[PDB]
Amino acid sequence: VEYRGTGRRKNSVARVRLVPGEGNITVNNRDVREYLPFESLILDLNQPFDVTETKGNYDVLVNVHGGGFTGQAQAIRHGIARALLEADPEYRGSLKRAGLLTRDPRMKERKKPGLKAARRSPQFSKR
Amino acid sequence: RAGQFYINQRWLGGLLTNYKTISKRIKRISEIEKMEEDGLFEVLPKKEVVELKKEYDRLIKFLGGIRDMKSMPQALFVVDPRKERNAIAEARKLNIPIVGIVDTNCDPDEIDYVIPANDDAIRAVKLLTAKMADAILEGQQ
Amino acid sequence: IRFEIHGDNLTITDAIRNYIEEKIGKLERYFNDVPNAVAHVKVKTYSNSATKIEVTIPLKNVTLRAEERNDDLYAGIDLINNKLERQVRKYKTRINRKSRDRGDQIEIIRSKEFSLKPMDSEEAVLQMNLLGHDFFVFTDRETDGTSIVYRRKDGKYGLIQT
Amino acid sequence: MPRKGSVPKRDVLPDPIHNSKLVTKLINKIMLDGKRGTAQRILYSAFDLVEQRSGRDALEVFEEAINNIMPVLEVKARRVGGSNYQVPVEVRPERRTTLGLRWLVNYARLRGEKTMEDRLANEILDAANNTGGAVKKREDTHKMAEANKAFA
Amino acid sequence: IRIRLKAYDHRVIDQSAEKIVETAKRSGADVSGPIPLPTEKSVYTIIRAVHKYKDSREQFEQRTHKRLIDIVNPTPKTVDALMGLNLPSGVDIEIKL
Amino acid sequence: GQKINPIGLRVGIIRDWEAKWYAEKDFASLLHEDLKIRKFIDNELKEASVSHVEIERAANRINIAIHTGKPGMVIGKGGSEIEKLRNKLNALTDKKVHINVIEIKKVDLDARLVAENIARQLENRASFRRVQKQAITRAMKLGAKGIKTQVSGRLGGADIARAEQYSEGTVPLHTLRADIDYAHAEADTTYGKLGVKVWIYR
RNA sequence: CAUGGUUGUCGUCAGCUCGUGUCGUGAGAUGUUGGGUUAAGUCCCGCAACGAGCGCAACCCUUAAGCUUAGUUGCCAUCAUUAAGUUGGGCACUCUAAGUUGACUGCCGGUGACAAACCGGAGGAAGGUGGGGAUGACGUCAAAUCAUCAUGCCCCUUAUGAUU
């Protein structure tokens, strides 16, 4: 059993799979606490399968790609959310109402020319 | 019943005098309903379908009784010269003869053919505007 | 209250550099009682017609522009300072209107008048519908009495004679 | 759009340790220059000294300390010109939450010790015991807005 | 064999990829079809003013659309499309053997 | 305002190229050979009703397509001047093979012609407002939809320059569907240069 | 400050005009105002105005989720001889990289009366011009460049041009 979902946020793609077992993540073939830096946002990263209560059910073992640590995280909780709707397909409203299953809503904004960087206009003296 | 041309909504403001731009749009109502009975309707955006139909009803709102009329009239029949004073002022510039229902709060000077009757009652209209509508039918044959 | 002076194709002297600050400078120093600003003086020669003088003094809210198209660069500033002194008084009396004496601190039934008129009951139904009103009161054409046609909670019509 | 109407305020994510929204909002205000981890570690080492110098767990102590910080009257200036132009106005509940967090951090940065290991926790136990520096400016607002009470 | 298909327009490099995939399958070929390589664009940022003004400029870019065609059944009928030069307008073909 | 030219929106969006070749290595030098023979074709033809040219290069057989509102004048007398052009065009570059020419109907609805033939109505110095109105009235008479044209500097012979535009018809400069074609000529009148823009549509 | 080109600027500011008709002895007026809506002279009502153009929205580009085609130098769950050759096979599946299907107040409920909107839902990944870019109306400033060019006039020609 391999329920393989994908997930994107902030220029960082994250594809997951779901092998049965218990809750244990193997991001880039290594431990999460030695890969994700400070362990705070991991309990916010466990929010999507919290509402389906499949804690001791699924090992995931993500292969992540690109971005940063808050771009790799917040993309595997969106990663397994596309995979949780092929594990519990009737539980789509439990993830739609609370968070995870929305999108990659927003990335960095374009630097316009004639300007310092990304909508921050430069200082002028004489008003 | 008379086979003549009616006006239900407000006077459009020039349909006897600036009707070289009103018949420009009576040409449109002879065209816009032809435009969607044939093709050239699936390729259009679904909201452009709306404004092409939002134009379509608003033509037959005001110009609905001038649907088949393509020339100037030769007589005009008004129910009230007070509320329809825009029409009577266009009548006297074109020397078109005029007949109308007048009462109190109506000037009979601009009406050539005067019908003194009540104006704020339905049977006072309907049992008086029907015979004048009937008046042309036995003038045909 | 500096003077970034610069002349388009005119060599600036030092007799101008004392005549500016006496008139453009000092007569606006006693205006703007908390001052920190920079002036700008252009002198643009035109060989076909004349010279011109542009004096711009920006401030916190409203700037101060004036122009003279004279050729005398000493008599023209006698008119620039005239236009400058007028514009400051416009600015100050705009903001000197702070002195304004400002001392800090049932069921209504709307009547709709109607004039009673004689008609058929069918006419009263017609006129009532043309307004969507649930009540229409009239004098009956044949009975002569005051009649109220109304729409019941039934949705049917009722007729009251008063 | 602050003149079309009001801006739609957005949701935050509560802390994992204390299970509190109020802790994460304290993380974001002590987050100088976008550094999330290097500021969150300091707060996670600025309530252990709270729980060392008092036996109670700090999630009780935090919401007890901020109640000596959060004022109930403040001053909004109305442009009346020659009047006092200082109207004593009560505080909306959203600004009631925020402005207590502001005073708690802004005077934690002006103590004798250098580490915010114990710059923060000293002012919390002062605010837990209704004393210190972030408490005493609440009383300064309650000696300013409560002195010009002629504009209720 | 890796027939390199790169060009400036995207409507032209796609219709010239349809030529070479058609004039090879008529012969004895086993064509792995056109897969699109990523476009190697390049942005040029000139300034708009004749004399003075920065802080108001026009950016320019030029995009090359890269594809490749490879065959692994070389017959003398397959190379009739290779020797047969077609669509020489705005596409170059770097024929490798 | 600062209206940019209407072709520049649409090059490749709703139009195509006046040069459709490719060269990865040595892109620079053989791009200069284009505007060598964009100056050179504009030298000896000298308003032979030429609207614009196209260049395509392939395997040292480099093509040149000219439109020539007066066709045959570049051809000559049965292929005379077209062969008399390749006697110099094949010397300024190496090959210049397969020089040809196509024809266009509606000789003065292409905007390059419309700007040019009324700019040459300014060296004789006669009634610039009618020189405007000659172009507008003839435009939708011949089959156009929207027309717009102006003259900028030393207008009428005076000192102060004044723009003077005349317009009717749908000219959607901001709509990206529109096949707007403009041109700019350099009509001298021996008291400066008059500039003239045009705008045609359909 | 004689000009053509060309760019800032008020300013992304929502305005600027025309046909025909009417009113006024006419300069002109209406249209463009009034009622309330919108980012908008954006729509909907009411009115001697009816329509049209230039702007505004959109079409263009990019970003956000999908499908179909084609899978290498790209990407390796399942096979291992992982130095990782990411190699053998091709795994082509996902990913990525490129050719196209789709978001508009389409769809409901309000009491809100029909007058469009607004307000609150659900429906998709996306929701109210989605985010951003490109595009800058009539015009203002004798605004800025005769040093990118181009040329009216004036001036220079053992030099105000040259060469080191």
Side-chain angles (χ1 to χ4, degrees), chain A residues 1 3 5-38 40-43 45 48-58 60-87 89 93-96 98-99 102 104-115 117-119 121-125, chain B, chain C, chain D residues 2-75 77 81-82 86-91 93-113 115-152, chain E residues 1-8 10-76 78-79 81-86 88-92 95-97, chain F residues 1-12 15-17 19 21-23 26-45 47-48 50-60 62-72 74-80 85 91-94 98-102 104 106-180 182-187 189-202:
Chain A
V1 176
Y3 291 157
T6 62
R8 298 181 183 92
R9 187 180 185 273
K10 199 175 175 66
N11 198 358
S12 66
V13 67
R15 65 267 186 98
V16 303
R17 68 183 66 251
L18 293 176
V19 60
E22 63 94 21
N24 194 0
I25 319 296
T26 315
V27 285
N28 285 322
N29 297 114
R30 62 183 291 165
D31 195 2
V32 183
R33 276 82 64 193
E34 297 294 327
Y35 186 74
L36 275 73
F38 55 89
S40 176
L41 46 89
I42 301 173
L43 292 178
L45 193 68
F49 63 94
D50 196 2
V51 299
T52 60
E53 286 89 10
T54 61
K55 272 81 72 175
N57 196 3
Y58 287 155
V60 179
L61 60 94
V62 189
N63 192 1
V64 79
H65 185 273
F69 57 91
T70 61
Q72 290 171 354
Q74 292 182 356
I76 73 104
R77 66 182 292 274
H78 186 274
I80 67 102
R82 291 184 184 270
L84 191 59
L85 269 69
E86 65 184 1
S94 65
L95 279 77
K96 184 187 288 183
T102 57
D104 44 352
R106 54 190 175 93
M107 64 292 298
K108 293 183 73 69
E109 194 268 331
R110 181 257 173 88
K111 177 183 181 295
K112 274 84 70 176
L115 191 145
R119 83 177 64 248
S121 67
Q123 182 180 1
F124 65 97
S125 67
Chain B
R1 185 178 64 85
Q4 293 294 321
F5 301 106
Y6 60 92
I7 291 295
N8 288 320
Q9 299 296 321
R10 70 175 177 88
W11 191 259
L12 192 63
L15 62 96
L16 262 68
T17 310
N18 197 359
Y19 71 101
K20 66 181 288 184
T21 61
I22 305 299
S23 66
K24 183 69 179 294
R25 301 179 71 200
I26 302 167
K27 188 184 288 184
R28 180 65 60 85
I29 197 63
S30 67
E31 191 268 331
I32 192 168
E33 67 181 3
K34 186 260 289 181
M35 187 269 177
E36 65 183 1
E37 287 182 353
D38 63 356
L40 294 173
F41 185 75
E42 193 271 332
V43 74
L44 296 175
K46 272 78 69 178
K47 67 184 291 184
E48 189 172 357
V49 174
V50 176
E51 290 104 15
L52 265 293
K53 190 174 182 179
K54 191 67 178 292
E55 184 177 358
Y56 176 73
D57 58 353
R58 193 262 303 277
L59 263 66
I60 53 94
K61 283 182 183 292
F62 300 100
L63 295 175
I66 316 298
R67 178 68 183 87
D68 293 332
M69 188 176 180
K70 302 295 185 291
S71 66
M72 74 291 290
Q74 295 181 358
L76 199 150
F77 182 75
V78 68
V79 68
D80 193 4
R82 184 178 64 246
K83 289 178 71 174
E84 201 69 24
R85 65 185 183 272
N86 291 319
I88 311 299
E90 298 184 356
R92 294 182 67 187
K93 289 183 70 174
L94 297 171
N95 291 318
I96 295 171
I98 182 62
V99 56
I101 302 99
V102 302
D103 54 353
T104 314
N105 285 318
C106 292
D107 192 1
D109 195 2
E110 61 267 15
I111 290 96
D112 196 1
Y113 290 144
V114 174
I115 302 171
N118 197 3
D119 207 3
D120 57 355
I122 297 98
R123 290 174 69 89
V125 173
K126 185 174 174 65
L127 293 175
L128 194 275
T129 194
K131 184 174 173 66
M132 292 298 107
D134 189 74
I136 58 98
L137 292 175
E138 62 267 9
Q140 293 179 356
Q141 68 271 14
Chain C
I1 191 65
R2 297 177 184 177
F3 291 96
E4 295 184 357
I5 53 96
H6 48 278
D8 193 1
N9 293 320
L10 186 143
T11 62
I12 190 69
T13 65
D14 289 331
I16 301 166
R17 295 296 303 275
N18 200 2
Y19 185 75
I20 292 295
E21 287 80 0
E22 183 67 28
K23 291 183 180 180
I24 304 299
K26 289 181 182 179
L27 274 77
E28 283 80 3
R29 292 297 297 164
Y30 58 88
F31 295 105
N32 302 117
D33 55 356
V34 281
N36 42 1
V38 174
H40 296 282
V41 175
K42 286 185 178 180
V43 177
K44 294 190 286 184
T45 61
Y46 298 101
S47 66
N48 288 318
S49 67
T51 63
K52 69 184 290 183
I53 297 168
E54 296 180 354
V55 172
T56 66
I57 298 170
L59 292 175
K60 292 181 181 179
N61 291 319
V62 176
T63 65
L64 297 172
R65 291 179 63 92
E67 291 182 354
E68 286 293 327
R69 292 182 183 272
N70 290 318
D71 201 3
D72 290 332
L73 47 85
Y74 287 160
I77 300 171
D78 293 332
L79 278 76
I80 291 295
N81 198 6
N82 195 2
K83 289 183 180 180
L84 261 293
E85 202 272 333
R86 181 178 173 87
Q87 291 180 0
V88 180
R89 297 174 69 186
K90 181 184 286 184
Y91 173 71
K92 294 183 73 68
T93 62
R94 184 182 297 275
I95 53 95
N96 287 319
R97 57 186 179 179
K98 296 179 182 179
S99 296
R100 297 292 180 91
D101 196 0
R102 192 263 181 275
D104 289 331
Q105 63 185 357
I106 61 169
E107 295 181 356
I108 295 172
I109 296 173
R110 203 187 187 177
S111 185
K112 181 182 275 294
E113 185 178 357
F114 180 75
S115 169
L116 205 50
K117 298 187 192 266
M119 61 189 78
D120 205 66
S121 63
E122 304 291 9
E123 184 77 6
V125 176
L126 205 228
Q127 289 183 46
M128 192 204 301
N129 289 335
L130 291 174
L131 308 173
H133 273 188
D134 307 315
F135 292 104
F136 196 99
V137 47
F138 66 112
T139 152
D140 197 83
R141 180 178 69 197
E142 298 309 302
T143 290
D144 302 300
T146 297
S147 288
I148 297 111
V149 188
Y150 65 93
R151 178 177 286 103
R152 305 171 69 71
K153 300 179 179 179
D154 235 288
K156 299 181 181 178
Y157 294 93
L159 191 59
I160 282 159
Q161 185 175 2
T162 52
Chain D
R3 291 198 294 179
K4 275 82 173 180
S6 179
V7 57
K9 195 262 182 182
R10 67 189 185 183
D11 195 2
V12 298
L13 195 279
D15 190 73
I17 300 298
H18 292 284
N19 197 0
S20 178
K21 294 182 183 293
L22 198 279
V23 175
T24 309
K25 191 177 187 295
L26 198 152
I27 296 169
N28 290 319
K29 202 264 185 294
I30 67 173
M31 184 177 70
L32 193 148
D33 199 74
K35 292 182 181 180
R36 179 67 62 85
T38 318
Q40 189 179 6
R41 185 186 297 113
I42 287 173
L43 178 59
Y44 285 164
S45 296
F47 77 99
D48 56 355
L49 184 63
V50 173
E51 292 178 353
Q52 191 267 329
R53 291 182 291 118
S54 178
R56 295 176 293 172
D57 287 331
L59 78 160
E60 183 181 2
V61 183
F62 281 167
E63 62 184 1
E64 193 269 330
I66 62 172
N67 291 318
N68 291 317
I69 306 297
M70 293 157 72
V72 301
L73 289 177
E74 60 93 21
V75 174
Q86 286 180 355
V87 177
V89 179
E90 68 271 16
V91 185
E94 289 84 3
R95 186 173 174 85
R96 181 68 179 271
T97 303
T98 297
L99 191 273
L101 270 299
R102 296 172 61 86
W103 287 350
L104 189 145
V105 179
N106 288 317
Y107 281 167
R109 297 177 183 175
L110 294 174
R111 296 182 66 88
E113 63 273 13
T115 64
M116 200 173 285
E117 185 75 25
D118 56 353
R119 281 178 183 269
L120 187 64
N122 287 318
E123 191 69 29
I124 293 167
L125 267 297
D126 289 331
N129 292 318
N130 200 359
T131 184
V135 172
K136 71 181 292 295
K137 82 172 294 185
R138 181 180 64 85
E139 185 66 29
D140 288 331
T141 59
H142 290 296
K143 288 181 182 179
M144 186 67 202
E146 279 76 350
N148 195 359
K149 290 295 291 183
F151 297 97
Chain E
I1 284 177
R2 281 88 170 91
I3 306 300
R4 305 288 293 169
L5 273 299
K6 63 190 291 185
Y8 281 157
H10 70 281
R11 66 187 184 275
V12 179
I13 196 65
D14 198 1
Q15 69 182 358
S16 294
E18 292 292 328
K19 184 263 296 180
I20 190 167
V21 77
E22 193 270 331
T23 58
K25 295 191 293 292
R26 57 97 175 173
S27 297
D30 52 0
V31 182
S32 297
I35 56 99
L37 295 175
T39 61
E40 188 178 2
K41 66 183 289 185
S42 66
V43 179
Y44 293 101
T45 308
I46 55 98
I47 57 172
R48 289 172 62 87
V50 47
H51 182 271
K52 174 175 68 175
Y53 301 95
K54 280 174 95 280
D55 204 77
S56 177
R57 65 190 64 194
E58 187 71 27
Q59 58 186 357
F60 280 158
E61 72 271 15
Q62 62 92 30
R63 294 181 292 175
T64 177
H65 296 285
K66 294 172 70 68
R67 284 91 168 94
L68 73 157
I69 298 296
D70 51 351
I71 55 172
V72 288
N73 193 1
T75 70
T78 53
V79 301
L82 276 74
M83 279 72 164
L85 189 146
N86 291 318
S89 65
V91 177
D92 58 346
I95 293 99
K96 188 262 186 294
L97 330 156
Chain F
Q2 293 295 322
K3 286 85 174 178
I4 76 169
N5 52 1
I7 297 297
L9 274 304
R10 298 172 178 89
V11 181
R15 289 177 61 86
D16 285 328
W17 289 96
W21 53 267
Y22 178 74
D26 196 4
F27 183 77
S29 179
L30 64 93
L31 187 274
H32 300 297
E33 295 177 354
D34 289 332
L35 70 155
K36 286 293 289 183
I37 63 171
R38 264 72 176 267
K39 293 187 289 185
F40 186 73
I41 285 175
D42 288 332
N43 282 318
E44 63 261 8
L45 286 178
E47 61 167 2
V50 172
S51 68
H52 55 91
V53 299
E54 288 86 2
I55 307 298
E56 191 271 325
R57 300 189 180 183
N60 288 317
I62 61 100
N63 294 114
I64 299 96
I66 315 100
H67 285 279
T68 68
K70 292 180 182 179
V74 69
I75 300 170
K77 301 285 103 176
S80 297
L85 183 63
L92 194 147
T93 183
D94 287 332
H98 296 286
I99 176 65
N100 55 3
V101 57
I102 62 100
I104 51 96
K106 265 64 186 299
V107 62
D108 51 358
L109 287 182
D110 287 330
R112 295 291 298 163
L113 264 296
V114 180
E116 186 68 29
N117 58 3
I118 67 101
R120 298 282 84 81
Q121 291 179 356
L122 295 172
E123 283 83 1
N124 56 3
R125 193 178 64 248
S127 181
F128 60 92
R129 290 182 66 190
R130 193 265 303 161
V131 170
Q132 293 286 317
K133 189 62 65 68
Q134 187 65 255
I136 284 101
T137 306
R138 184 261 302 154
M140 72 290 293
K141 179 70 175 177
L142 196 63
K145 190 182 289 183
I147 189 66
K148 180 177 174 66
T149 177
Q150 69 179 359
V151 168
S152 179
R154 299 299 297 270
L155 187 271
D159 292 332
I160 297 170
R162 288 184 291 112
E164 182 70 28
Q165 62 182 356
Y166 294 96
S167 300
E168 75 267 19
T170 300
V171 187
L173 293 173
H174 292 173
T175 300
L176 273 300
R177 279 88 174 273
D179 194 2
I180 307 296
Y182 92 108
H184 184 269
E186 196 180 1
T189 56
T190 325
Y191 51 85
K193 296 190 292 293
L194 272 69
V196 49
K197 295 184 178 68
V198 293
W199 287 273
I200 60 99
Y201 179 62
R202 308 306 302 272

